[PDB]
C-alpha cells in the first residue's frame, strides 16, 4: 500500500487530512473548525515569543 497509509505517523495524517471521506455537500459553515485550529496556533506562537520579553 502507499507509504502515507503504511507508516505509523503518516497514516494518522492520511486518515485525518488526506483520505478522510467528507460528505460532498458540506458548505462554508464547515470551514470554522480549521479556522479554530489556526487561531489556536496563532495564539500559542505569538504568546511564546512575547513571553520571552514579559515580566
Amino acid at each position: 500500500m502507499a507509504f502515507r497509509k503504511s507508516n505509523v505517523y503518516l497514516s494518522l495524517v492520511n486518515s485525518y487530512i488526506i483520505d478522510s471521506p467528507q460528505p460532498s455537500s458540506i458548505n462554508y459553515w464547515w470551514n470554522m473548525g480549521s479556522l479554530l485550529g489556526l487561531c489556536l496556533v496563532i495564539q500559542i506562537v505569538t504568546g511564546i515569543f512575547m513571553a520571552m520579553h514579559y515580566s
Binding site: 500500500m1 502507499a2 497509509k5 483520505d19
Partner: protein, 431 residues
Amino acid sequence: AEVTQLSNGIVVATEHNPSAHTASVGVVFGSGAANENPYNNGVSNLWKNIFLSKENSAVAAKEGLALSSNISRDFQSYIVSSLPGSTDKSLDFLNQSFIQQKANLLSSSNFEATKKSVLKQVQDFEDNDHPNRVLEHLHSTAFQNTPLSLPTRGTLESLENLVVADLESFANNHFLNSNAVVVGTGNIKHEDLVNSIESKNLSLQTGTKPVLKKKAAFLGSEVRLRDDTLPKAWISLAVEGEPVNSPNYFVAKLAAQIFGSYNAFEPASRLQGIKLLDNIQEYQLCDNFNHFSLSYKDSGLWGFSTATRNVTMIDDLIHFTLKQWNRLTISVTDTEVERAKSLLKLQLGQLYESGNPVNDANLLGAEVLIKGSKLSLGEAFKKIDAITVKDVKAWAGKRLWDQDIAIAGTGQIEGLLDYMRIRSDMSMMRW
C-alpha cells in the same frame, strides 16, 4: 508473406499461403459503428446477424461453405470460408447475397426473428459481460458526441426502434463500391481470384460516395456504473492513444507491452519481468489487468483494464499503476524496453500468423482500407527493433505526462477515488 493488391473496377486484396487446408473470401467495407448515428446505432450489427441467419446460412451449408462476419468501429466485414477447390463457389454466394438476395434476406419473417435475437444478444452483454461492457463505455465517454463513442453492438433503445428501411438506407449509403475491398486469404492465388471477379462485370451503384461527418476527439471524463451487487470491481482507464498510420503506432504498442497483462492465479504470470508486480502482489490488489494500445482511423486509446475483489484497496491499485506509467517519461530502463520488443514481436506474430484465414482476412482488410496497403510482419519487426528508450520517453512525455484521462467502471467501485485524484497521479512533484 506476400501482400498482393490490384485495382480494376473494384480493389482486390489477397495474401496467399501454400499450406492452409482452407480458403476464406469476403468483402470488407470502409464503414462501421463509427459511421452510424445515435438513433440508428446497431444497424451494422443487425446486418451481420441476418447475413448469418438460419436461412442464408443453410444455403451456404448445403454448398459446404461456412459464414463469418465482424462489426468493428472503422470497418465491417462479411466472410465465407471454403475448401481450396470451391474458391469460386464462395464468390457465387457472395454476389447472390449482396445483389440478388439483398431484398430476400430482408423479409418480414426473417427480420423480426433476427431482431428478437440481437435484442437478447445485446441485453445479455449488458447484463453479464462486465469487462467488455466497461471497455465499451470507456469509448463512449472518452469519445462522447463523436463517431468512436457509438458501441459496435448498438444500444437496446436504438435497436428495438430499428426497421427494414434503416437497413436499406445504410446499405445504399455505405455498401458502395468506392467504400469496399474484396479480400481473399487461405491458399488461393491473387491471379486466381481477380480473374473470377473481373469475369463477372456489372458495377452496381458505382461513382457513389458515402456521407461525411465530423472528426473524432478525446475528452477527459468518466462514467461510473456503480453496482454493489456485483462480486468485483471492473475498471478501464486510458489516455488519448495513437491512430493507425501514426509514427508512434509501434512506440505506443511497445509501451503497453512493458506493463503487459496479468493473472494472479497463473503461477507463471506472477513471475513476469514487470516492476508493477512487486507492488500489487503484496496485498493482492487485483485478480487481473491488461494494458492495450487501441488504434483507429482518427484516434486511439492507451491505458489498461483491471478486475478486483480487493474493494477497499482500489486506490492503491490505481496509484501504483499510474506511478509505473510515470516512469515511461523519466526512468524506463533499456532492459524493460528490450523485454517489450521481444514480447511485442511474439504477440504480433501470433496474431498476424495464426492457423485461421478468417482472422487473416480481417487483419488484411482493415489495413488496406485505411492505408491502401499492408505492412509485412518482417517490416514491423524492423520498426520495433529500432525503438530506443529516448523514443518511449518522448512519446510518454507527450501522451501520458500530466494529460487528461478517461475512466469507466462497474461493480463495487465505491473505493475508486474521484477524478482529480486519479488525474493528479499522471505526474510527479519535482524541484
